[PDB]
Design a protein around this ligand. Sequence first.
Ligand code: RYX
Ligand code: ZN
Length: 258
Amino acid sequence: HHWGYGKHNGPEHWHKDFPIAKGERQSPVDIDTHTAKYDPSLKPLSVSYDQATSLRILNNGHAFNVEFDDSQDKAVLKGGPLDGTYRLIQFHFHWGSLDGQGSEHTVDKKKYAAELHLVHWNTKYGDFGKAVQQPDGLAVLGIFLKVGSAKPGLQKVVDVLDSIKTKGKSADFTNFDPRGLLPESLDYWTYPGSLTTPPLLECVTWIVLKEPISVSSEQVLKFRKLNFNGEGEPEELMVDNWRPAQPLKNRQIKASFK
Ligand SMILES: NS(=O)(=O)c1ccc(C(=O)NCC(F)(F)C(F)(F)F)cc1
Ligand SMILES: [Zn+2]
């Protein structure tokens, strides 16, 4: 046993090994649209993924990560609330056992079926390990998934999932274009927060897109066939791998749009 999402080891238990769980800038949060302040000084986000180099997909026992080559300034996030250049290192999702739950952020207490996190690190810190120890070390771009029409750009991910069913399995995953996971609009909300899994470090500038993407029920079903457990262990379906909303405390969520 370590941390997870079960009754015995789930989010309510995390603070015992990670006391920052009750800290002042924990994520996710509910985004109250009537209270987020429009900030006309925010810049447009700049998402430069044309030279992205995906490498590998890995089931890590809590989600699956699609990992990228981050040894140079290939796929980067710049602009919006950010200073400097943040390199994409990996993306992953959180999702539910049912379509009415699964996202980590909520919008006016509305839950989406899933949430995509594109994780980037601030190049001024040299490496990802150094970046997570800094209050401005990461930028995570969060995108909500609603169940509807299929997302064609997601299908290459859903088709490889059978090959990484269990914890610690990985597969080569090259030539994957993460632009195919973006919505039309880059309007966003932003706030200072944390990693949403242990060690829950308070190193993240959250940029959460307003426009969800649509995925089909067949595609999200495939997420829910993954397993938390390793090969040969008792089957535990990888579902409901989301942390509930944490109190906002002394923070302000800004909107990029009016
Ligand atoms: N869900 S999330 O907020 O996007 C999120 C993104 C990245 C990480 C992450 O790198 N954990 C690994 C780690 F922090 F455990 C390490 F110290 F970095 F090894 C966790 C949560
Ligand atoms: Zn995440």
